[PDB]
Design a protein around this ligand. Structure first.
Ligand SMILES: *[C@@H]1O[C@H](CO)[C@@H](O)[C@H](O)[C@H]1O[C@H]1C[C@](C)(N)[C@H](O)[C@H](C)O1
Ligand SMILES: *[C@@H]1O[C@H](CO)[C@@H](O)[C@H](O)[C@H]1O[C@H]1C[C@](C)(N)[C@H](O)[C@H](C)O1
Ligand SMILES: CC(=O)NCC(=O)O
Ligand SMILES: [Cl-]
Ligand SMILES: [Cl-]
Ligand SMILES: [Cl-]
Lengths: 7, 7
């Protein structure tokens, strides 16, 4: 993970 | 990708 969003 | 570094 480590990324973010939101999709 | 998804991992990091830095090499
Ligand atoms: C991770 O490194 C790349 C280069 O490969 C940069 O362009 C990017 O800004 C950097 O990402 C940030 C944001 C993220 C992905 N949510 C994490 O918090 C990382 C550690 O820092
Ligand atoms: C997402 O990350 C930011 C930066 O650290 C925090 O400010 C925010 O609280 C965080 O969102 C929470 C709530 C969410 C979106 N429902 C998920 O549980 C994420 C993983 O954590
Ligand atoms: C070295 C590099 O590009 N790291 C970023 C990733 O792991 O996604
Ligand atoms: Cl992070
Ligand atoms: Cl999402
Ligand atoms: Cl690197």
């Amino acid at each position: 993970x480590x990324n973010x969003x939101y999709x």
